[PDB]
Amino acid sequence: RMSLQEKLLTYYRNRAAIPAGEQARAKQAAVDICAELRSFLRAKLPDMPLRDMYLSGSLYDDLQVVTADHIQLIVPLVLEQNLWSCIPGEDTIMNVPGFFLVRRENPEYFPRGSSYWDRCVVGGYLSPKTVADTFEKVVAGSINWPAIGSLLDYVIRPAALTLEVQYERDKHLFIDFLPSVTLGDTVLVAKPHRLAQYDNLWRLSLRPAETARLRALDQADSGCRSLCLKILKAICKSTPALGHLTASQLTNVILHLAQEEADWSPDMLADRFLQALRGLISYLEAGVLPSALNPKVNLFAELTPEEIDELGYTLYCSLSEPEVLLQ
């Protein structure tokens, strides 16, 4: 009979880990499109204030699990300090940490037209929706995907902000464009809040710091923090009743545990996995999962009380059903 340690490594091998060739070729296809858009953007849209779009997401980080089929292209707006301010959610009437307003400064003094992005402002705030609608239309209006693909031998076709890239004749990858804004030390992305009434808010960007801290910890001591995370990701992705859980939530569960446990030797994987599980359950029971980097942010905040309850129950039930959890 197998130890839990072995069952987890077996599971990772057979289910979580992407075939290494697929992982590299998928990622390289995304890298290829990125560079070609780098040239296009300069040549075609000098009008629009942006920097070079860059890749982001698990696929780029060797953190994607089960299958290599998605990655983000960050579309980084250039905003000048004088014209824009970001308001933290705790200071808005919405009162939601982890989300910001992007306020256009004093239009009596800086009239509409002082920035290209004035055309995406609503009621004095830069709109995440509108920025994304606007960018979509302006790229569509000048981009020739058929010749880009022709160039790279990829077949590329938009779905709206999502490209389906057919790199090998039988393989695909989805690239979606994620508008971003950096004001001072704050990085935001146009990833909408779940609820419509919060649709004026930009989302605080957490992933890069989180995943960097995860790498730093693992690199320093050669630990299994990333391996444990990927297993957790594959389980949640593979289990329908767990669909609500996110990679960011799981990563922060790991980060909290790492603050209390120094030994993440390969031999402790089983023990840490169990702590992670019992940790996740407990956060759900309290209905609060603080961000390890921004403890004011509750990562369960977009989950209803009943959804959190069913997540907790599903996980408690799975303790008796290890073979369904590791299918």
Q: With CB under 6 A as the contact rule, which of the stretches 9-17, 52-60, 129-137, 162-170 interacts with ligand ADP?
A: 52-60
Binding of ligand ADP at residue 57 (CB under 6 A)?
Answer: yes
What one-character DSSP code corresponds to residue 205? P
Name which of 200 and 211 has its Cβ closer to ligand ADP. Answer: 211
Looking at beta carbons only, is 208 or 295 nearer to ligand ADP?
208
Report whether 56 belongs to an annotated binding site: yes
Residue 216 Cβ vs ligand ADP, minimum distance, rounded to whole Å: 17
Query: Which residue in the set 8, 12, 50, 72 belongs to the binding site for ligand ADP (CB under 6 A)?
Result: 72
Which of 19, 208, 243, 295: binder of ligand ADP (CB under 6 A)? 208
For residue 271, give the H/E element and its range: helix 269-286
Which of 115, 127, 200, 205: binder of ligand ADP (CB under 6 A)?
Answer: 205
| 207 labeled part of a ligand binding site | yes
> Alpha-carbon distance 99 to 87, whole Å?
9
For residue 109, the Cα-to-chain-centroid distance in whole angstroms is 37
- Is 70 annotated in a binding site? The answer is yes
- For residue 104, give Cα distances in angstroms to 101, 111, 181, 295: 10, 10, 13, 28
Residue 249 makes contact with ligand ADP by CB under 6 A: no
From CA 280, how far away is CA 298, in angstroms rounded?
Answer: 13
Residue 215 interacts with ligand ADP (CB under 6 A)? no
Q: With CB under 6 A as the contact rule, which of the stretches 26-34, 56-64, 93-101, 259-267 interacts with ligand ADP?
A: 56-64
Asked if 318 interacts with ligand ADP (CB under 6 A), we say no
Dump strand ranges (E) for the chain.
Answer: 54-56, 70-77, 84-88, 99-104, 121-122, 125-126, 155-158, 162-166, 172-183, 186-189, 202-204
Could you give the CA distance from residue 233 to residue 210 in angstroms, rounded to a whole number?
15
Q: How far is the CB of 6 from ligand ADP (least distance, A)?
A: 25
- Which of 205, 215, 228 has its CA nearest to residue 277? 228
Binding range to ligand ADP, per CB under 6 A, among 14-22, 58-66, 83-91, 124-132: 58-66
Q: With CA atoms as reference, report the closest residue to 71 among 41, 37, 38, 26.
A: 26
Nearer to ligand ADP, 21 or 208 (CB): 208
Which residues neighbour 245 within 8 Å (Cβ) at sequence distance 6 or greater? 236, 280, 311
**Exposed e or buried b per residue across 50-68, where buried means at least 16 C-beta atoms within 10 angstroms of its C-beta:** beebebbbbbbbebbbeeb
Count of residues of this chain found to bind ligand ADP when the rule CB under 6 A is applied: 15
Residue 247 near ligand ADP by CB under 6 A = yes
77 and 120 Cβ atoms separated by less than 8 Å: no
Stretch of 121-129, 155-163, 202-210, 223-231 lying at the interface with ligand ADP (CB under 6 A): 202-210
The answer to whether 244 is a known ligand-binding residue is: no
Q: Least distance (Å) from ligand ADP to the CB of residue 144?
A: 26
| Length reported for the chain | 327
* Residue with tokens 């989300």, as numbered in its chain: 99
Tokens standing for residue 196: 């419509």
252 binds ligand ADP (CB under 6 A): no
By CB under 6 A, residue 73 contacts ligand ADP: no
Is residue 254 within 8 Å of 229, Cβ to Cβ?
A: yes
| Residue 19 or 208 with smaller CB distance to ligand ADP | 208
List residues forming the annotated binding site for ADP.
56, 58, 70, 205, 207, 233
List residues forming the annotated binding site.
56, 58, 70, 205, 207, 233
For binding to ligand ADP (CB under 6 A), which residues are involved? Answer: 56-58, 63-64, 72, 74, 178, 189, 191, 205, 207-208, 233, 247
